[PDB]
Enzyme design. Structure first.
Site, PDB file in Angstrom:
ATOM      1  N   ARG A  37       0.811  -1.221   0.000  1.00  0.00           N
ATOM      2  CA  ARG A  37       0.000   0.000   0.000  1.00  0.00           C
ATOM      3  C   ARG A  37       0.845   1.272   0.000  1.00  0.00           C
ATOM      4  O   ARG A  37       0.317   2.385  -0.168  1.00  0.00           O
ATOM      5  CB  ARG A  37      -0.919   0.023   1.227  1.00  0.00           C
ATOM      6  CG  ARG A  37      -0.165   0.165   2.569  1.00  0.00           C
ATOM      7  CD  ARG A  37      -1.117   0.271   3.764  1.00  0.00           C
ATOM      8  NE  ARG A  37      -2.129  -0.768   3.668  1.00  0.00           N
ATOM      9  CZ  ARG A  37      -3.422  -0.537   3.477  1.00  0.00           C
ATOM     10  NH1 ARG A  37      -3.881   0.706   3.382  1.00  0.00           N
ATOM     11  NH2 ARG A  37      -4.242  -1.559   3.315  1.00  0.00           N
TER      12      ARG A  37
ATOM     13  N   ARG B   4     -11.971   4.814  16.670  1.00  0.00           N
ATOM     14  CA  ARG B   4     -12.306   4.933  15.244  1.00  0.00           C
ATOM     15  C   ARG B   4     -13.599   5.759  15.143  1.00  0.00           C
ATOM     16  O   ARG B   4     -14.712   5.263  15.394  1.00  0.00           O
ATOM     17  CB  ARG B   4     -12.470   3.534  14.646  1.00  0.00           C
ATOM     18  CG  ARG B   4     -11.152   2.752  14.658  1.00  0.00           C
ATOM     19  CD  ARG B   4     -11.329   1.259  14.368  1.00  0.00           C
ATOM     20  NE  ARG B   4     -11.978   0.990  13.078  1.00  0.00           N
ATOM     21  CZ  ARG B   4     -12.126  -0.229  12.559  1.00  0.00           C
ATOM     22  NH1 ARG B   4     -11.664  -1.291  13.214  1.00  0.00           N
ATOM     23  NH2 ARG B   4     -12.737  -0.394  11.386  1.00  0.00           N
TER      24      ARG B   4
ATOM     25  N   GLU C 299     -14.049   5.429   6.865  1.00  0.00           N
ATOM     26  CA  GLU C 299     -12.857   4.701   6.466  1.00  0.00           C
ATOM     27  C   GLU C 299     -12.879   4.220   5.016  1.00  0.00           C
ATOM     28  O   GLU C 299     -13.938   3.858   4.520  1.00  0.00           O
ATOM     29  CB  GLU C 299     -12.696   3.487   7.383  1.00  0.00           C
ATOM     30  CG  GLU C 299     -12.476   3.880   8.851  1.00  0.00           C
ATOM     31  CD  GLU C 299     -12.406   2.696   9.789  1.00  0.00           C
ATOM     32  OE1 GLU C 299     -12.440   1.534   9.327  1.00  0.00           O
ATOM     33  OE2 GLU C 299     -12.313   2.940  11.004  1.00  0.00           O
TER      34      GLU C 299
ATOM     35  N   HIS D  29     -11.658   1.296   2.457  1.00  0.00           N
ATOM     36  CA  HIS D  29     -11.155  -0.071   2.503  1.00  0.00           C
ATOM     37  C   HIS D  29     -11.207  -0.735   1.145  1.00  0.00           C
ATOM     38  O   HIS D  29     -11.961  -0.319   0.254  1.00  0.00           O
ATOM     39  CB  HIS D  29     -11.968  -0.890   3.506  1.00  0.00           C
ATOM     40  CG  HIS D  29     -11.727  -0.505   4.936  1.00  0.00           C
ATOM     41  ND1 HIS D  29     -10.557  -0.802   5.608  1.00  0.00           N
ATOM     42  CD2 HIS D  29     -12.512   0.156   5.826  1.00  0.00           C
ATOM     43  CE1 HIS D  29     -10.636  -0.350   6.848  1.00  0.00           C
ATOM     44  NE2 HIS D  29     -11.811   0.232   7.007  1.00  0.00           N
ATOM     45  N   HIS D  30     -10.384  -1.762   0.973  1.00  0.00           N
ATOM     46  CA  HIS D  30     -10.359  -2.492  -0.284  1.00  0.00           C
ATOM     47  C   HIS D  30     -11.303  -3.694  -0.283  1.00  0.00           C
ATOM     48  O   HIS D  30     -11.228  -4.563   0.590  1.00  0.00           O
ATOM     49  CB  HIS D  30      -8.920  -2.921  -0.583  1.00  0.00           C
ATOM     50  CG  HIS D  30      -8.014  -1.773  -0.875  1.00  0.00           C
ATOM     51  ND1 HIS D  30      -7.457  -0.987   0.111  1.00  0.00           N
ATOM     52  CD2 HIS D  30      -7.627  -1.228  -2.059  1.00  0.00           C
ATOM     53  CE1 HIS D  30      -6.764  -0.006  -0.450  1.00  0.00           C
ATOM     54  NE2 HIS D  30      -6.856  -0.127  -1.764  1.00  0.00           N
TER      55      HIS D  30
ATOM     56  N   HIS E 240     -17.543  -1.598   9.067  1.00  0.00           N
ATOM     57  CA  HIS E 240     -16.349  -2.373   8.741  1.00  0.00           C
ATOM     58  C   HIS E 240     -16.152  -3.513   9.743  1.00  0.00           C
ATOM     59  O   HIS E 240     -15.771  -4.636   9.382  1.00  0.00           O
ATOM     60  CB  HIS E 240     -15.101  -1.486   8.716  1.00  0.00           C
ATOM     61  CG  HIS E 240     -13.868  -2.216   8.285  1.00  0.00           C
ATOM     62  ND1 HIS E 240     -12.923  -2.679   9.180  1.00  0.00           N
ATOM     63  CD2 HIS E 240     -13.439  -2.591   7.056  1.00  0.00           C
ATOM     64  CE1 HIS E 240     -11.966  -3.308   8.518  1.00  0.00           C
ATOM     65  NE2 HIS E 240     -12.256  -3.269   7.228  1.00  0.00           N
TER      66      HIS E 240
ATOM     67  N   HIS F 291     -16.651  -7.837   9.139  1.00  0.00           N
ATOM     68  CA  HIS F 291     -15.641  -8.841   9.448  1.00  0.00           C
ATOM     69  C   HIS F 291     -15.932  -9.685  10.693  1.00  0.00           C
ATOM     70  O   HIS F 291     -17.045  -9.564  11.264  1.00  0.00           O
ATOM     71  CB  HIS F 291     -14.272  -8.169   9.585  1.00  0.00           C
ATOM     72  CG  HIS F 291     -13.732  -7.633   8.293  1.00  0.00           C
ATOM     73  ND1 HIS F 291     -14.416  -6.717   7.523  1.00  0.00           N
ATOM     74  CD2 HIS F 291     -12.586  -7.907   7.624  1.00  0.00           C
ATOM     75  CE1 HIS F 291     -13.716  -6.450   6.433  1.00  0.00           C
ATOM     76  NE2 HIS F 291     -12.602  -7.158   6.470  1.00  0.00           N
TER      77      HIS F 291
END
EC number: 3.1.-.-
Lengths: 83, 131
Positions: B5, B96, B100, B102-103, B127, B131
């Site tokens: 990255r 947080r 955000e 994210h990929h 996010h 997950h």
């Protein structure tokens, strides 16, 4: 000085809020730190929403935010600003 | 040869049409896509790292009337500096507190770092819930 809101004079707290509102920091981390500190100091349920997502008809200018915090703490039996 | 990255590359991809609820979509499903408007502004530009790309996305959002009209004065001041904007409290988690990037297909699994069609905007809570 930055341990609790009673350590802040109202003018000092407005300076803090004004810095946050204008994102007058040198990094995002610094801004997040100030917002987190604001939340901890006010103890208000809305947290950072007082700054970024105001209720319909709320004065979200720095002075408006200080007033909302001031009134809320007084009405909820919490200590207020120094002096 | 470390962290992919942080290697330079050019931004590619089309993005998708979005509306007034673009950021609200970041708290649902797989997050919101990169707007087609933003993709047109960043395409072909070379970035030194993903974090530099992140900064460019938020700076462009701060200059886009449709995408920013949905941020209040204080959040507008933040994106104007290239910072990510704060999400509503109910979408924050711990330290947080900002939107955000994210990929979708992870970089560690062959996803492209600067392919805007492979990037999604999510709230911290989404996010995590994903997950």
């Amino acid at each position: 000085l930055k341990h609790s809101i009673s350590d802040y004079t109202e003018a000092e707290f407005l300076q803090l809020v004004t810095t946050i509102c204008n994102a007058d920091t040198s990094s995002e981390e610094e801004l997040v730190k100030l917002v987190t500190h604001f939340e901890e100091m006010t103890e208000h349920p809305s947290g950072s929403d007082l700054i970024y997502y105001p209720k319909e008809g709320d004065d979200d200018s720095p002075s408006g935010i200080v007033n909302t915090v001031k009134q809320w703490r007084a009405a909820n039996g919490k200590s207020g600003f120094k002096q | 040869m470390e962290s992919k990255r942080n290697k330079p590359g050019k931004a590619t991809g089309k993005g998708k049409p979005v509306g007034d609820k673009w950021l609200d979509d970041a708290g649902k499903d797989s997050g919101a896509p990169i707007p087609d408007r933003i993709a047109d502004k960043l395409r072909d530009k070379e970035f030194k790292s993903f974090d530099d790309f992140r900064k460019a996305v938020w700076e462009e959002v701060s200059k886009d009337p449709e995408l920013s009209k949905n941020l209040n004065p204080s959040n507008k001041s933040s994106v104007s500096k290239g910072y990510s904007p704060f999400t509503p409290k109910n979408q924050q988690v711990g330290g947080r507190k900002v939107y955000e990037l994210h990929h979708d297909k992870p970089i560690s699994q062959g996803g492209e770092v600067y392919d805007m069609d492979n990037i999604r905007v999510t709230t911290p809570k989404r996010h995590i819930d994903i997950h």
